Amino acid sequence: GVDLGTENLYFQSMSPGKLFRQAVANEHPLQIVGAINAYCALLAENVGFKAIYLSGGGVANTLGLPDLGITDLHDVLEDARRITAATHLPLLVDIDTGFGGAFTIARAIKEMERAQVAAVHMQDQVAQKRCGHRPGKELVNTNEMVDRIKAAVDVKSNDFVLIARTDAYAVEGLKATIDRACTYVEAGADMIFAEALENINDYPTFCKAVKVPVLANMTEFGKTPLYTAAQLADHGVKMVLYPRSADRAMSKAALAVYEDIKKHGVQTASLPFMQTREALYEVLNYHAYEDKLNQLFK
Amino acid sequence: SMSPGKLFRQAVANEHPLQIVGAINAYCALLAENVGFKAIYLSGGGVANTLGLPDLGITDLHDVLEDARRITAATHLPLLVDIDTGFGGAFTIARAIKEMERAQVAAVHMQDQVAQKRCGHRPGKELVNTNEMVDRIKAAVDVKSNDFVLIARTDAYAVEGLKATIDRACTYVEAGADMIFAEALENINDYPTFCKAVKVPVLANMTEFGKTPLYTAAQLADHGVKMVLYPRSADRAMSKAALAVYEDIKKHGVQTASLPFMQTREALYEVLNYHAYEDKLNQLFK
Amino acid sequence: SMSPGKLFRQAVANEHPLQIVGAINAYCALLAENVGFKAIYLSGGGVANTLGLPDLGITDLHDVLEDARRITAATHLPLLVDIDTGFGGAFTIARAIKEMERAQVAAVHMQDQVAQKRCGHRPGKELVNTNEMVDRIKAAVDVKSNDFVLIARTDAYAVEGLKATIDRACTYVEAGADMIFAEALENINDYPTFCKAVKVPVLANMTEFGKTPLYTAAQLADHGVKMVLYPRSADRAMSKAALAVYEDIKKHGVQTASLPFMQTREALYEVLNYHAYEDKLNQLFK
Amino acid sequence: GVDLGTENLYFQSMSPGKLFRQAVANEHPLQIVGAINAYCALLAENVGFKAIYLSGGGVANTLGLPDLGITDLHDVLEDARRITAATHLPLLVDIDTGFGGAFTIARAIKEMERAQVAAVHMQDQVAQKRCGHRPGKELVNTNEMVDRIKAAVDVKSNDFVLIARTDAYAVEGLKATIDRACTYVEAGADMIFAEALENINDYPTFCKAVKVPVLANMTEFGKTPLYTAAQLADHGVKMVLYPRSADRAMSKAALAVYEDIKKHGVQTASLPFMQTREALYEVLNYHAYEDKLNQLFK
Ligand SMILES: [Cl-]
Ligand SMILES: [Cl-]
Ligand SMILES: [Cl-]
Ligand SMILES: [Cl-]
């Protein structure tokens, strides 16, 4: 039903998760960028990225909360929905440890699918803990994460992408990490999110062992190095994620404007650092609104 | 115990003038607080644009309310909220005021633009009659608490000139508006006349990229202005900065060149007041 | 794989007629499903009244959308949703259709009443011009998927009589409405003429306590009607029953007299399909 | 600022939690009824009840979900908000085990207060558990519940009422129950929700030991008997809760109407069982809307 030139060729109607699978296959590698809101998703789309990301940490911090697992399915879901309403670019969503036991995880998968989300990642961290527990990083046993994956796979559609994230590497080293990852794939993970993988020549071994597409997480200000997308792909990596990059720059920029207005009683010095009205109207595709009204009405 | 509305009333009286900055989310509200502003603002245009929509009145009470709630959950800094034309007739307006108060909001502004119109109407800026805006104000005043601040915004100046603008403003005050949002006054020497006539605290809107010039806080205050609003200033800079990071990552396959332009982890932990979390847990537990 | 809208289209074609019952929440939608209805309905008046508000158009897209989402999360039974007059101009209507589709809703109906009006306007029922409703329909059709069902509702009959009603209906179909909601046809012998002229499936609204009489499904179908709606039937009975329990507890200091009128734990566990939860856990784990 | 007749007397401005405290003090005992939505809250108010209740089980079941702790703070909070928008009658809200650790509990208290809720109850059940855990009832240790209470008390306002609920009685017997309850009061619970207390002559001992107002939960179809409000008060009980009574009757009534419409092709036989339009307009206080428009406009 879709055309190429004047030639009517087969095109399959593509669901969010299939668009994502397709973006992985067609890119080398797929760069996925963090976006904290619909407008950022549009900036990313306009720059020409083929997939976007909703960070768990970002959702919390944007609420003015620490990334301590205070947020729930609704906090993430509402931000996801806002983004998928604005763009069909496949969206990857951080759902932490699933927000509870088997049926919470099921509800999260279904709600994410109803929100037109393309993929989620779920982590093998310890969840909930005691009331007064101090912040930190603990892994669950492989079997506890297997159960989480099964709860998810049990209700997902075929197209929808479950990415199991492991933080084993920093704590248990490369061998034990590869072991979990393989167990996670066997339990039904579609892909793997390798967190904090240091030396790039460990990638080919990691990727070859796990078989499914692997995502490398390019964070800042942590204890992991920054390689290029090309380098990571040459070492067998299929996705590269930039989770918080843009929002760290948005923050510094907003702080700078606030300080200018405070210090100078006016924002004149900030004008050069601001997006122009015209770029804004363009990213919002404002003209298509006027054009739609002319197409249909008066 | 001071109510949100009272904190705001107090910030107007005690600052010369009160600078109110736009913040699009809780995190921005915290940055603003940390820089030391005494009042913050939730722009209606910002709510739409943040959702990836044009400022064409597509958004409803729930869209603004949800963003307001997220900001008041993070900070007690008095918040001023743009509720457009009120989102409907008298009972919608009533619902909006009550919901805003229940959200711990300190003030709202409502405008004298024409609302809804016909289905296929073209975008623009048209004023309602003075009597239609009076009705709007009465609906709002009827349910507001004493402390809560209703600010009537008029866009009359560009369309009807300074005389007719002062007339509306005064009618709006008489209908029960607490303060006045004077939109798009070009010459600063319009202000002293406007402010003197209107009597109640007046807010001047310092926007960028419009058809209005930029004066300083001091200049505006010396000309009788009590509040100065910076509605989108921070978010225009956030957008350029996000765009720059996106372009860098795309062009260079990595974000290295962007690192100098990013807030450090430590500044982030600080704005989030992260240590108070660890300290609270040590105070109460193990 | 059948889309919500297609399931609904299919239920219209294959039933004679399709009975669509009101449900105010997911639990009611499940009771309805269990009794074996093939399509369910979310009333706009029900959404308002459930919130403790009169049906005066105080509610917005978010109010109806949230209730819709809760019901579609629990059941795949095709859901018909009252979106009133569309909640604003062309882009609000567009947003409403898209949001309803993203909510897995199968159909909506939109009415040709006048919307918003002046701030202090008195409640009532006034029609928009045919051209204003055409514009509404075009805004909706422009963004809908093929399968999704737009039902134009007209209240013309009581105000303008059968002739002018058939005229609008036909104009609405030509503008792209998939089906027709004929509101307040008194005499059943109005139906065959109406239905024959309009051609597309027609819905008759079987309300209580109004100014319209009650015919049976069979009667309505024999007179050319394809859907019959029971918009508030269940919720009027729920209200009487809740009131009765409240009065009992108040008057007797205990709810003993109410016990015979309550659904048993076991019927509840059954409607919730509770066993499938235990069975799922045994299937997958320990 | 408030008047009695023509005599201007002192009246304190009363916060939701104070209204609740006051309703306890002034009634003997206070009957609190379950209401699943704003309209039900209004029916209750109209019948003249002085406090209303939002059941956790009710929130889930109304969503078409089992009471298995699938729901989160947002599910309860949204239903609470809908009710407090319609009525100032003090509302008691079930927040289960608090939906997470210390800061989730803090967020729940603050969000409940911002919603104009008067009181909440929190339970000493085990939370979250493993992914594939089977449904059931386990108590946490007294110390784990103490921690939960402290998280709550730490952020609550003075007026706001924390009610600690214990399910110890059915599992651990009267002695151990009184022990927890006393520990919970000392940790800062304002009142106590005694679940499943069988023999009424155990109440005076229970109430005398715990000191703070005690709530007896009048459920149906469980393993607990039904006494009258008067009987329970004479035995030292200060609140009596009717958590699901009205919604069990609403369900049977809606099922009956659906079956009638199915079986008869019309709802004629159901008409006698339906609230009249006029009672509806009245409970909605529809006339006050017309009167308000006449007061202010044309
Ligand atoms: Cl714009
Ligand atoms: Cl610097
Ligand atoms: Cl009504
Ligand atoms: Cl029976």
Short mmCIF file of N, CA, C and O in Angstrom, two decimals, chain D residues 52-94:
data_model
loop_
_atom_site.label_atom_id
_atom_site.label_comp_id
_atom_site.label_asym_id
_atom_site.label_seq_id
_atom_site.Cartn_x
_atom_site.Cartn_y
_atom_site.Cartn_z
N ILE D 52 -15.43 9.30 55.75
CA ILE D 52 -15.49 8.40 54.63
C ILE D 52 -14.14 7.71 54.47
O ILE D 52 -13.17 8.06 55.13
N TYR D 53 -14.11 6.68 53.62
CA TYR D 53 -12.96 5.80 53.56
C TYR D 53 -12.72 5.34 52.12
O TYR D 53 -13.65 4.99 51.40
N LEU D 54 -11.43 5.33 51.74
CA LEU D 54 -10.96 4.81 50.47
C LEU D 54 -10.15 3.54 50.71
O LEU D 54 -9.03 3.57 51.20
N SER D 55 -10.78 2.41 50.38
CA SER D 55 -10.25 1.08 50.60
C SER D 55 -9.21 0.79 49.51
O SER D 55 -9.49 1.03 48.32
N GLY D 56 -8.10 0.15 49.91
CA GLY D 56 -7.03 -0.29 49.02
C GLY D 56 -7.52 -1.38 48.09
O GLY D 56 -7.38 -1.29 46.86
N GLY D 57 -8.18 -2.38 48.71
CA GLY D 57 -8.83 -3.44 47.96
C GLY D 57 -9.81 -2.88 46.97
O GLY D 57 -9.94 -3.41 45.86
N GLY D 58 -10.57 -1.87 47.41
CA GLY D 58 -11.56 -1.27 46.53
C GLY D 58 -10.92 -0.62 45.31
O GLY D 58 -11.46 -0.72 44.20
N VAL D 59 -9.78 0.07 45.51
CA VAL D 59 -9.11 0.77 44.42
C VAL D 59 -8.71 -0.30 43.40
O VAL D 59 -9.01 -0.24 42.22
N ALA D 60 -8.02 -1.33 43.86
CA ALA D 60 -7.62 -2.42 42.95
C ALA D 60 -8.81 -3.06 42.21
O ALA D 60 -8.87 -3.00 40.97
N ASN D 61 -9.77 -3.61 42.97
CA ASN D 61 -10.93 -4.30 42.40
C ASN D 61 -11.70 -3.40 41.43
O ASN D 61 -12.17 -3.85 40.37
N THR D 62 -11.83 -2.12 41.76
CA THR D 62 -12.47 -1.18 40.86
C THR D 62 -11.70 -1.08 39.54
O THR D 62 -12.30 -0.93 38.49
N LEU D 63 -10.36 -1.15 39.60
CA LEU D 63 -9.54 -1.19 38.38
C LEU D 63 -9.66 -2.52 37.63
O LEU D 63 -9.13 -2.67 36.54
N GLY D 64 -10.35 -3.51 38.21
CA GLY D 64 -10.46 -4.85 37.64
C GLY D 64 -9.25 -5.73 37.98
O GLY D 64 -8.98 -6.71 37.29
N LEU D 65 -8.60 -5.38 39.09
CA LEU D 65 -7.42 -6.04 39.61
C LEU D 65 -7.69 -6.68 40.96
O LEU D 65 -8.41 -6.15 41.79
N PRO D 66 -7.08 -7.85 41.24
CA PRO D 66 -7.07 -8.43 42.58
C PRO D 66 -6.26 -7.59 43.56
O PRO D 66 -5.31 -6.90 43.17
N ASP D 67 -6.63 -7.71 44.83
CA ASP D 67 -5.97 -7.02 45.93
C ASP D 67 -4.64 -7.71 46.23
O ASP D 67 -4.48 -8.31 47.30
N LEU D 68 -3.69 -7.66 45.29
CA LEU D 68 -2.46 -8.41 45.49
C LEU D 68 -1.25 -7.47 45.64
O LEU D 68 -0.11 -7.93 45.50
N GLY D 69 -1.50 -6.18 45.88
CA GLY D 69 -0.47 -5.13 45.94
C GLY D 69 0.16 -4.83 44.58
O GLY D 69 1.35 -4.62 44.49
N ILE D 70 -0.65 -4.87 43.50
CA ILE D 70 -0.23 -4.53 42.16
C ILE D 70 -0.26 -3.01 42.02
O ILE D 70 0.54 -2.43 41.29
N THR D 71 -1.20 -2.37 42.74
CA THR D 71 -1.39 -0.93 42.69
C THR D 71 -0.30 -0.20 43.47
O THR D 71 0.34 -0.76 44.38
N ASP D 72 -0.16 1.08 43.12
CA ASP D 72 0.91 1.93 43.64
C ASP D 72 0.30 3.19 44.25
O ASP D 72 -0.91 3.37 44.27
N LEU D 73 1.17 4.07 44.73
CA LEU D 73 0.75 5.36 45.28
C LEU D 73 -0.14 6.14 44.31
O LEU D 73 -1.13 6.72 44.74
N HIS D 74 0.18 6.16 43.00
CA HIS D 74 -0.65 6.91 42.08
C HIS D 74 -2.07 6.35 41.98
O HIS D 74 -3.05 7.07 41.80
N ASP D 75 -2.22 5.02 42.05
CA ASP D 75 -3.58 4.50 41.89
C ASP D 75 -4.48 5.01 43.02
O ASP D 75 -5.60 5.39 42.77
N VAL D 76 -3.96 5.05 44.25
CA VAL D 76 -4.74 5.36 45.44
C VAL D 76 -4.93 6.86 45.45
O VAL D 76 -6.02 7.39 45.72
N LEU D 77 -3.84 7.55 45.10
CA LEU D 77 -3.79 9.00 45.22
C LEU D 77 -4.82 9.62 44.28
O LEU D 77 -5.48 10.59 44.65
N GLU D 78 -4.92 9.08 43.05
CA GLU D 78 -5.84 9.65 42.08
C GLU D 78 -7.28 9.45 42.57
O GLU D 78 -8.06 10.38 42.52
N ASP D 79 -7.62 8.28 43.10
CA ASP D 79 -8.97 8.11 43.62
C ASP D 79 -9.22 8.99 44.84
O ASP D 79 -10.30 9.56 44.97
N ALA D 80 -8.19 9.21 45.69
CA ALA D 80 -8.35 10.06 46.87
C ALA D 80 -8.70 11.48 46.44
O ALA D 80 -9.67 12.08 46.93
N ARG D 81 -7.95 11.98 45.44
CA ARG D 81 -8.04 13.36 44.98
C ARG D 81 -9.43 13.60 44.43
O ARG D 81 -10.03 14.65 44.66
N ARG D 82 -9.96 12.61 43.72
CA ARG D 82 -11.27 12.75 43.10
C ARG D 82 -12.33 12.97 44.19
O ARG D 82 -13.19 13.85 44.07
N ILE D 83 -12.19 12.25 45.32
CA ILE D 83 -13.13 12.33 46.43
C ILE D 83 -12.97 13.63 47.19
O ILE D 83 -13.95 14.34 47.39
N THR D 84 -11.73 14.02 47.53
CA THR D 84 -11.55 15.25 48.30
C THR D 84 -11.92 16.49 47.47
O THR D 84 -12.26 17.52 48.03
N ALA D 85 -11.89 16.41 46.14
CA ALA D 85 -12.38 17.53 45.35
C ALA D 85 -13.88 17.75 45.55
O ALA D 85 -14.35 18.87 45.45
N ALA D 86 -14.64 16.68 45.83
CA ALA D 86 -16.11 16.76 45.87
C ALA D 86 -16.66 17.08 47.27
O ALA D 86 -17.77 17.61 47.37
N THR D 87 -15.91 16.78 48.33
CA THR D 87 -16.39 16.88 49.71
C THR D 87 -15.25 17.20 50.68
O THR D 87 -14.14 16.68 50.51
N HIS D 88 -15.56 17.97 51.73
CA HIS D 88 -14.66 18.28 52.84
C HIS D 88 -14.82 17.28 53.99
O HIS D 88 -14.10 17.35 54.98
N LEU D 89 -15.73 16.31 53.85
CA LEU D 89 -15.84 15.30 54.89
C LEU D 89 -14.47 14.65 55.06
O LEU D 89 -13.82 14.32 54.07
N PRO D 90 -13.95 14.49 56.30
CA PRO D 90 -12.62 13.92 56.49
C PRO D 90 -12.52 12.54 55.83
O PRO D 90 -13.42 11.69 55.99
N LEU D 91 -11.45 12.32 55.05
CA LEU D 91 -11.27 11.07 54.32
C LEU D 91 -10.11 10.26 54.90
O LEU D 91 -9.02 10.80 55.11
N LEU D 92 -10.37 8.97 55.16
CA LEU D 92 -9.35 8.02 55.58
C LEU D 92 -8.95 7.14 54.39
O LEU D 92 -9.80 6.66 53.65
N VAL D 93 -7.64 6.99 54.18
CA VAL D 93 -7.12 6.37 52.99
C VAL D 93 -6.17 5.25 53.37
O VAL D 93 -5.26 5.40 54.20
N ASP D 94 -6.41 4.11 52.75
CA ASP D 94 -5.58 2.93 52.89
C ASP D 94 -4.36 3.08 51.98
O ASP D 94 -4.50 3.14 50.77
#
